A = this chain, B = another copy of it.
Amino acid sequence: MKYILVTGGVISGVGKGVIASSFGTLLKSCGLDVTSIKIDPYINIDAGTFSPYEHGEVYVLDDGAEVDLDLGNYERFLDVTLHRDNNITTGKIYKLVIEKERTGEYLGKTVQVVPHITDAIQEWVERVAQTPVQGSSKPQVCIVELGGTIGDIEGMPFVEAFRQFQFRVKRENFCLAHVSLVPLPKATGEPKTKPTQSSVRELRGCGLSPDLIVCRSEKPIGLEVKEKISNFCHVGPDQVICIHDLNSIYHVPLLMEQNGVIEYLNERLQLNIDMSKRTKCLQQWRDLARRTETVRREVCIAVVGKYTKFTDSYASVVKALQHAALAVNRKLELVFIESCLLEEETLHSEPSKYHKEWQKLCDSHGILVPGGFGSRGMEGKIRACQWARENQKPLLGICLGLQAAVIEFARNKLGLKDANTTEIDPNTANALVIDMPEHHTGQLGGTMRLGKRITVFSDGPSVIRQLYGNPKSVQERHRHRYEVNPKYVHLLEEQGMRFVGTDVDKTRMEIIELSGHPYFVATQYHPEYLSRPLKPSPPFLGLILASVDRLNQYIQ
């Protein structure tokens, strides 16, 4: 095949993920079949035990492998369905090699980093880059992205493995893009090139040589600094790209394409791309990038979550709201509301912030309760569900709203003050939601119902069912272990609550939909993982429509 390593420069967070996804969505428009790999140099088998604050919004694949977030970036930009093995980590490699050694497949030899770990890495990359990722099309380009910055101790095995790969795989079949940062200190007033120079030198001291250099700055740098980069890093002034901070990332593919990163790649990897045909293929992205600027309607949605401090803990939620808002042709305006600044405990401590957050929640066309883990801020979600239930305000719950809304409904419509979750209060006599960990080896429901499953709609007219297109079953991605208690089912059904969607066994209620309320859907799965820029998700679409009050008109 043909590989494109995308290493990283001064810092982590410069834009490797967006640059890699842009390479992917260019080579995909030009006709090729692209796959991707993300290499995390951390010693973790998978992100299934990470916190959102670490790197943000643990993803979920179809087979059930909690992975990084760039694994979702790739899917949203390429419309592919990656697998568990598209995420290499130091832990995976070392565990594989250790198991092989113990079982004796390295029979009588000193297993050392070079060459055994790097041969494991190369065989992993070569075996994964050929797994059919979009049906039955054998891939043709593989965008490997190396996490972290060049120079770390954790990423020495990978830089060495690729230093050998670039010769093992016939260098005409291997590019390398080095994304770097060009700071512009406000005190001085001129962009500085020493960081990129030092990073390029450190990358050369490891053998590799940058075939491209993407200079990521805040404002467009002039031509003086491009000449300085080209000279002091020894690359042609046409293979140094400048990508400043654009408005939306749907502009990065186009900004690179107008800098000839299709011409350069087709010359450097010999891809045989027909330019006389590639013109009218990157059109949906121009359309999207223009709709990103030509919307003035200001629909404001409330996100009442726990981790609302770093704006990457909800990357999937935010990028699934933006897709729907762009599809309806309204302009999104997100407000982030903590769920702990909604209980009386801060009313006694900080009434100022209490009232400020409650006001923000009040003047907002819609409410969204994300998922999460733990007991902190769980009662604030109950408060928000109660408010949106008694104020006729649209609301959507994803895998934890379906819990924090049944809890409310029960407590404040049937009086069971004892209602709670088996996690929150294990000694409750009213367990409205109980776990179902009967696995013992994973064949029953049991452990976290990870991956994609089957959800069939029960009978009856339902707004969310109409939204999906009235099919019989849809497959979404669950990351839950609990469930609604099957003895409060009728107790909550002889009230304003419904139960439309569930599985084949019919003992896992997963789509609740209040009656009389304009929009009070809440689902047990994660509908945000299946959203794509040209194919938004039906629950978020319904939330936005019912929020700007166009839902019935859209239905008709």
Contacts and interface: CB of A to CB of B under 8 A. Distances in A.
Contact of A111 (B14, B42, B55, B186): B42
Given A107-B49, A234-B164, A153 B95 contact: no
Interface residues of A, number: 68
Nearest to A202: B198
Interface string A132-170: 000000000000000001010110110010001001000
Contacts of A245: 186-187
B11 A112 contact: no
Interface in A66-116: 90-91, 94-95, 97-98, 101-102, 104, 107-116
A50 B185 contact: no
A112 B91 CA distance: 10
Interface in A177-207: 181, 183, 185-190, 192, 194-195, 198, 204-207
Contact of A153 (B15, B111, B113): B113
A283 interface: no
A432 interface: no
A154 B13 contact: no
B187 A15 contact: yes
Contacts of A186: 218, 245
Given A187-B245, A234-B167, A195 B13 contact: no
B101 A91 contact: yes
A232 B55 CA distance: 19
Contact of A11 (B51, B111, B117, B195): B195
A444 interface: no
A92 B41 CA distance: 19
Copies in the complex: 3
Contacts of A90: 113
A54 B110 contact: yes
Given A117-B43, A181-B185, A183-B181, A50 B11 contact: no
Nearest to A184: B183
A59 to B, nearest CB: 16
A515 interface: no
Contacts of A154: 112-114
Contacts of A207: 204
B111 A43 contact: yes
A97 B89 CA distance: 14
A311 interface: yes
Contacts of A255: none
B11 A185 contact: yes
Nearest to A201: B151
A217 to B, nearest CB: 10
A466 interface: no
A110 B189 contact: no
Nearest to A45: B102
A392 interface: no
Interface of A: 10-15, 41-45, 49-51, 54-55, 90-91, 94-95, 97-98, 101-102, 104, 107-117, 149, 151, 153-154, 156-157, 160, 164, 167, 181, 183, 185-190, 192, 194-195, 198, 204-207, 218, 231-232, 234, 245, 310-311
26 contacts: A10-B10, A10-B195, A11-B195, A12-B192, A13-B187, A13-B190, A13-B192, A14-B185, A43-B98, A43-B117, A45-B101, A49-B108, A50-B108, A51-B109, A54-B108, A55-B110, A91-B98, A91-B101, A94-B94, A95-B98, A113-B154, A115-B231, A153-B157, A181-B185, A204-B207, A205-B205
